[PDB]
Structures are given as C-alpha cells and as structure tokens.
Amino acid sequence: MLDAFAKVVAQADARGEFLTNAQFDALSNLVKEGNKRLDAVNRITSNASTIVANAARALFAEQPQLIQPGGNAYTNRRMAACLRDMEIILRYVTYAILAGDSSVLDDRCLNGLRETYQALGTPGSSVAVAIQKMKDAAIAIANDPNGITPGDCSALMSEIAGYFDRAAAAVA
Amino acid sequence: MKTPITEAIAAADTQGRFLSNTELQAVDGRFKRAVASMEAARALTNNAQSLIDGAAQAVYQKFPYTTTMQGSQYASTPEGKAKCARDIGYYLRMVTYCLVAGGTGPMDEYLIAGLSEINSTFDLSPSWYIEALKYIKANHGLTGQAAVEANAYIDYAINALS
C-alpha cells in the first residue's frame, strides 16, 4: 500500500534519484492542506450509513428491476449483500482519501471486482450508478460550509470525486 | 510500504471498519511532524554529493585496507570506489525517503530487507557502512527537530547493521 508520500518515494527510488524540488513542494503542500483532508475523511466516515442508505434508495427508485423478484437485489440476503458492497467501496474510498493515493482502493477493493460481479450476474453498471450516487452525497457532506472554518476545498473534492469515479469505472 | 498513514489504514482494514478518531489523530501528528522532517530531507538532498564524497573518505581513512586489498569487495580499484560511493548514496537517499514518508518504511523495504544476506554474500563489512553513517550524522549540519528526525533514521540504519 502507498500513500501520496510513499508513491513519490517509490517513483524516485525506481530511478535511483533524490526528490526534486517540485516533488518536495507538492508533498509539502499536501501537508499544509492536511486539515481539510482530515475533515473530508471524518465527515464522510461519520455519515457513511446515511450516504449508503440514501444512495441505495435512489438506485432502486431509478432501477426498479433490481428489486423485482428475480432481480439481483431481490431477497433480503441479496439486498444486504448489495448494501454491504456499497459500504465496502465507500470504506476503501475513505482510505484512499486519507492516503492521498488510490493504491489501497485499487489493490484491495477494485482489482478483480468486475470479474466478480460478472461471475455472479450482478450488473456492474448498476453498481457504478450506486457508487456515483454515493459520490455526490459524500461530496455534498464533505464540502458543506456549515460548522467548518471557511476555506477552499475544491482541489480535494476533485481528488475525492476521482476516487469514486475510478471505482465506478472499475465495474462499469 | 509502512508509513504512519498506511499503518492506520491497515489497522482499520484488518478489522473491516472505517478509520477511528485515534487513527485520524495519528495522521494529524504525522502532518505536524512532517514540517521539520521534510526540512531535513531537502537539506540532505541539497548537500548530498558533499556528504557522499566526504562519507566515502571517512570510511577509507577509518579502514585503510579497503584502499589496497585486492578483491572485488574492496575499493581497491576505481570500480570498487564507484560501488562504494554508489552504496553510500543509496543509504543517504533512503534517509531522505524516510524523512519524506514519516517513517522507516522506505529503508525497511528497499535496503534493510535482505541487508545481512547481501553484506555476507558479497563480503561487505557493515562497519564500513556504519562509519559512513556516523560521518553523515556529524556533518549534515542540521539542528533542532530537523536534526532529531534525521538522526533517528540514521541511528535506525546503524542499528540494522549491528
């Protein structure tokens, strides 16, 4: 697993090189902006059950065939597996946010996930939609100006969006 | 790779759970420490060649036989001196990487794993590399906690050679 710092170190080590000033500057900026990253992780983590439930309700309002009998989310066992999958993906995304690198999400969650759903008959495009709904909810929560010190989190929200988008693309 | 941030993630993942408040506080602490630690890494990087060159001489002055004993494993020859300067550069680079990442992981993974086997197989004396390390610790010219963070990873390397 890599965080943003280890990624830069690994890239540098493969070339046998000390860090450049551009790399130092990028990592120092990540540190200086660190409080915002911690808030995003904290806020999304603290609201995770809400993000999952509302994204699931939205998914099934939009794709009612999933909850018709015979649909992939019909029976409480399959519905519970689906909700669990949404929470798993969200959990690994919060790890990527803390790390500032997608490696943990790629290696421990996304790798092989498309094939897993194909083998099950779970439609990956529906999982991608669930993920995108969680994205929008997580970012509205993480970027909410209420009860937080005013400042610009837009670069971080784009980074967060990219992790969600990368997860959706992995199953789409 | 072990860092304070990946350690926190790994603990949460091991238990299938979201990150705890105590894990976020651990990353905050890493961010607070990163300031001086990255200061040291830039300083060492900017003066690396002087430190490498000076460290090479420190070793030869402490162990003059490495100057003249015939053998691959000696700085006997110009290629031996190249290999030795290279290795010293490797150790310094690893210290910069630990300072950048906030812990020992880069040196654990890229240098310490297998170190004893490499030094044994290739007839390389650990004392050689310890002397190089002591010279870097005394001549990097850092102070305050930048020197604290740096000398921690230096001592850590000396210990792995002991």
Ligand SMILES: *[C@@H](C)[C@H]1/C(=C/c2[nH]c(/C=C3N=C(/C=C4\NC(=O)C(CC)=C4C)C(C)=C\3CCC(=O)O)c(CCC(=O)O)c2C)NC(=O)[C@@H]1C
């Ligand atoms: C974007 C995410 C929104 C935003 C973020 C923002 N936060 C701060 C300042 C702080 N954030 C924290 C949070 C933590 N510190 C920790 O150690 C932990 C783990 C337990 C957390 C969650 C803290 C302590 C601060 C400093 C004190 C404070 O509340 O001001 C800022 C200010 C700038 C900075 O980086 O310090 C900002 C901008 N603000 C917004 O408007 C976004 C919606």
Ligand SMILES: *[C@H](C)[C@H]1/C(=C/c2[nH]c(/C=C3N=C(/C=C4\NC(=O)C(CC)=C4C)C(C)=C\3CCC(=O)O)c(CCC(=O)O)c2C)NC(=O)[C@@H]1C
């Ligand atoms: C929910 C939006 C959609 C859905 C989900 C669904 N998933 C499964 C079964 C499994 N899901 C996984 C995924 C993971 N397990 C892990 O450990 C990890 C990370 C390491 C992931 C990403 C796996 C492995 C399975 C099979 C094994 C298991 O169930 O534990 C199901 C059940 C399939 C069945 O027929 O029993 C379902 C329903 N279905 C939908 O319709 C949503 C689009």
Ligand SMILES: *[C@H](C)[C@H]1/C(=C/c2[nH]c(/C=C3N=C(/C=C4\NC(=O)C(CC)=C4C)C(C)=C\3CCC(=O)O)c(CCC(=O)O)c2C)NC(=O)[C@@H]1C
């Ligand atoms: C300098 C203190 C003394 C010295 C140096 C010397 N080293 C070698 C050969 C090797 N050095 C290493 C060290 C590393 N390889 C790595 O990947 C890492 C971590 C990034 C380290 C620390 C290794 C593995 C070798 C063997 C493989 C190689 O040749 O690269 C030599 C040559 C040994 C030989 O028999 O050809 C020398 C001379 N010798 C002295 O006398 C200096 C005091």
